[PDB]
Design a protein around this nucleic acid. Structure first.
Lengths: 47, 137, 77, 118, 59, 173, 94
RNA sequence: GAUUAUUGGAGGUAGAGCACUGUUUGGACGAGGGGCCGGUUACCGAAUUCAGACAAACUCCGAAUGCCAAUUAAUUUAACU
RNA sequence: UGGGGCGGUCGCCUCCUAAAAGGUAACGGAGGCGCUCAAAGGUUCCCUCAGAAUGGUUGGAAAUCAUUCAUAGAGUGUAAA
RNA sequence: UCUGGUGACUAUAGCAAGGAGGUCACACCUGUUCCCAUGCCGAACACAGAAGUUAAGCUCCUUAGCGUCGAUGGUAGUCGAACUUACGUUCCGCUAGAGUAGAACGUUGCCAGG
């Protein structure tokens, strides 16, 4: 169990901290989240 | 020697002695009985002594019922040591009886024998007692 | 020694407003675990199972069925 | 063994549904029933236990032997016109304990086509 | 009715010598040597057994 | 071959019982053919093969039952597929049963063969089967370990005498 | 089987009840079909004699004011510690 | 603001009770081990029942009083920032 | 800290003590936390206990399968309420 | 003003048992071509019909059999006061639970047919 900081590609920021467990989800996880720079839901990804 | 096979909580509050008997005030199984008249605790050895003294006088004759069971444990610190380092260890088991409570019942024996046997039992107990029969009317 | 000296901070549960008094539109009415009291008219239910008023009015505790109770709020004024 | 009845199960499911479902005279309830052959529709304002409009497959205004489904379509059109006089605005569709499929779905789509605001 | 995962069963001609028990089906689809019309016009694979000739009880 | 039963509705029952109407008549409802435990601590492929055998026996894919608990005295937990079953209702039921009654006792080799009474008083049988009369279509050619089966015939009956009246129709009482 | 009774007036308090019990009386009720519910008093000794002569489950034609009522005993509150009766309910069988 | 009267409401104490949990005394009933050849005979543990008992960490029930508050009315003089 | 010492404890959560609002002490009586989950979260549809016998291939007597009562005694990630 | 649909009332409404009924309704019923579907199955859901039945469900009637409700009177406990120190007493007020008599085999709003 560890923390994770997501990062957008176009919003140019990282303001979404989530948590995951390595052994069950070792790969980087990606989701759709609303970053308000672009004012739309965009694809954030673990980094 | 009477005690429960298990209890949820070993250490308990000491019971209450004010009031009258909630129940168990009438003979139901036998012909004669010993009713209490004052209040006290009975300590599970007194019962044994009374039962023995009442059994041998009847000489494997009639039948005896004990209407009382000590459910409640009481604690004791072994040596008189400082106050207050936790509650002590279990020492015995008690039943509480209030006036009206029937303690022992007997059947299958004559009235005078019942009276004498229950007298011998009463002299082994910490409470005043009284001989009684089945209620009628 | 002993090993029994623990307890938690008591939470101030129970009724916070009475049957018959006026309240405002976000006031707490009953804090509890689970649903001892259910919500009725113009009454909400929060994540802590807390009961609150949606609008301004007088509060009425009443039965729900045979063995349940609820609160309601009515906007008479 | 024993065979279960269907309508009591339907009523359990319908009671579970109708916990956030009620009429308020501007979003009234559109209750539906079907036994084996016909279908019945009733508009209700649950605040007073009052109903406003009624329709059925055996109503002589609409009664044939077409499909058992176009019949429900006609019932939808009929109750829609009946409520067009008053309270034809956005409403709430109470499906009973029935799926939104087949006769009920057809009835609802007909009601929507006939000008209702749901 | 979920097509694809079930086996293949068909009313083969189960014409036994004893009573012609043509009330079976399955994957015993032998060469259609006999297609009885009263029975299934299908494989005669269930053609002879000890079914209805001599039972332990009803011999 | 359903018309046999359709005639037996009155050939024996309306006579022996004299029903007031035709609908108060006993009637087969479902056939459950549950195989058995076969503890697959390592025999998972064996249970798969047994499932294939049941697919050959019946015209329906079996549904596989997992352990409902983690019962001690056995190495298992919740999950762990340790059973299989099929439930038959109509045409498959009759097409299976007309074959089964034909090929059972000649392959069972017993006069009584089943029981005088294995019922609960509600129209249920609880028949145990040693797995030889079954697969009369693809016989013992490749399989290695024999199996056992547990079949039940749940009907509309409410007692054992009506079940016996029905077992009069191709049964071994 | 010919008991008497006196009717209790309204609002008997604890003190008067225990005075009545210090005396040889005992409170009682009469209910059942044929009459409404009435609260009365009875002499304990006479009631005991009637019970001795008639039996526990027996009938008594007791007098209430102007009239008489055939009646059976329903229940009785009894004090086992001083062996006296403290209340008795009468049921009109008619 | 305070006291009282009349009303409404939250709550599970004293007391009672055994409907859940656990503790218990007699009695029956018949089933499993058992004394034996897979079984009789007695004895065990369990279940179901009959009647009686126990409980701070049991409750099918449930006060008195205290608590909150009312279009609130009558007597008093506090109350708040 | 029922002198001090040795011993034990030091934060948080849940019961009882606690006196039917809330609150309430002891080196009073019982137990837990220092997380876990990418589904064990959201929404839409469907579904419903064990236990008990009944009875049977298996049979631990009971595992799976089947009818009926069962009133949450089922189950609810994690203590208790 | 019979049935049905849909709502409000703490089961006085339920459970159990016994007896009657049906194409205006209700239902079991026939089947899986199509919509759709069963961690297998048209059992269920869904679909197309109306050959057959009142047997079952459902409706009506009867019973207080189980369950439910439940007074009066009395008791326990208790507020206040006065005795007092008794495992208490007395006076005043509130009056429980259990049990008993008894009640009840549902009341009623809206709508369409009849």
């Amino acid at each position: 169990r560890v923390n994770v900081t997501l990062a957008c590609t176009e919003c140019g920021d990282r303001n979404y901290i989530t948590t995951k467990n390595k052994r069950n989800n070792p790969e980087r996880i990606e989701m759709k989240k609303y970053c308000p720079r672009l004012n739309k839901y965009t694809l954030h990804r673990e980094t | 020697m009477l005690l429960p096979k298990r209890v949820k909580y070993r250490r308990q509050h000491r019971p209450k002695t004010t009031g009258r008997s909630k129940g168990g005030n009438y003979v139901t199984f036998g012909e004669f009985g010993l009713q209490a008249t004052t209040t006290s605790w009975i300590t599970s050895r007194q019962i044994e002594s009374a039962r023995i003294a009442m059994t041998r006088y009847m000489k494997r004759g009639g039948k005896v019922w004990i209407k009382i069971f000590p459910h409640t444990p009481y604690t004791k610190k072994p040596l008189e040591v400082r106050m207050g380092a936790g509650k002590g260890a279990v020492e015995g088991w008690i039943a509480v009886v209030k006036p009206g409570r029937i303690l022992f019942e007997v059947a299958g024996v004559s009235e005078e024998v019942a009276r004498e046997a229950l007298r011998l039992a009463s002299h082994k107990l910490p409470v005043k007692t009284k001989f009684v029969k089945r209620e009628e009317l | 020694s002993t090993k029994n000296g623990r307890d938690s901070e008591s939470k101030r549960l129970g009724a916070k407003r009475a049957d018959g008094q006026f309240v405002t539109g976000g006031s707490i009415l009953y804090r509890q675990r689970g649903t001892k009291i259910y919500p009725g008219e113009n009454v909400g239910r929060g994540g802590d199972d807390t009961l609150f008023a949606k609008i301004d009015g007088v509060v009425k505790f009443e039965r729900k069925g045979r063995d349940k109770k609820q609160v309601s709020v009515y906007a008479v004024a | 063994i024993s065979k279960i009845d269907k309508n009591k199960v339907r009523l359990k499911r319908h009671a579970r549904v109708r916990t956030n479902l009620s009429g308020t005279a501007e979003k009234p309830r559109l209750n539906v029933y079907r036994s084996n052959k016909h279908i019945y529709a009733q508009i209700i304002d649950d605040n007073k236990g009052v109903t406003l409009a009624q329709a059925s497959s055996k109503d002589s205004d609409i009664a044939t032997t077409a499909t058992k489904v176009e019949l429900a379509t006609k019932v939808g059109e009929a109750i829609a016109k009946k409520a067009a006089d008053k309270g034809i605005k956005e409403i709430v569709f109470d499906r009973g304990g029935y799926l939104y499929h087949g006769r009920v779905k057809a009835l609802a789509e007909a009601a929507r086509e006939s000008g209702l605001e749901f | 009715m979920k097509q694809g995962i079930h086996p293949e069963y068909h009313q083969v001609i189960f014409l036994d010598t004893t009573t012609n028990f043509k009330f079976l089906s399955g994957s015993t689809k032998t060469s259609s040597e006999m297609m009885e019309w009263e029975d299934g016009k299908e494989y005669p694979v269930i053609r002879l057994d000890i079914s209805s000739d001599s039972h332990p009880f009803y011999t | 071959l359903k018309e046999k039963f359709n005639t037996e509705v009155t050939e024996n029952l309306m006579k022996k019982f004299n029903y007031s109407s035709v609908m108060e008549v006993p009637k087969i409802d479902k056939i459950v053919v549950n195989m058995g435990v076969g503890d697959a601590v390592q025999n998972s492929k064996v249970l798969d093969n047994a499932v294939e055998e049941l697919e050959l026996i019946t015209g329906q894919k079996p549904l596989v039952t997992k352990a409902k608990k983690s019962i001690a005295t056995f190495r298992l937990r919740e999950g762990m597929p340790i059973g299989a079953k099929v439930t038959l209702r109509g045409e498959r039921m009759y097409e299976f049963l007309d074959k089964l009654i034909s090929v059972s006792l000649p392959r069972v080799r017993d006069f009584q063969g089943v029981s005088k009474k294995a019922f609960d008083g509600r129209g249920n049988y609880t028949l145990g089967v040693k797995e030889q009369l079954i697969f009369p279509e693809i016989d013992y050619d490749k399989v290695s370990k024999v199996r056992g089966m547990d079949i039940v015939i749940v009907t509309t009956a409410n007692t054992d005498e009506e079940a016996r009246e029905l077992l009069a129709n191709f049964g071994m009482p | 089987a010919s008991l008497k009774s006196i009717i209790r007036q309204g609002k008997q308090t604890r003190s008067d009840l225990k005075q009545l019990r210090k005396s040889g009386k005992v409170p009682a009720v009469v209910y059942g079909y044929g009459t409404k519910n009435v609260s009365v008093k009875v002499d304990e000794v006479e009631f005991i004699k009637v019970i001795r002569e008639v039996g526990r489950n027996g009938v008594i034609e007791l007098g209430v004011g102007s009239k008489t009522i055939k009646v059976m005993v329903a229940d009785y509150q009894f004090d086992p510690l001083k062996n006296q009766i403290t209340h008795i309910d009468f049921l009109a069988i008619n």
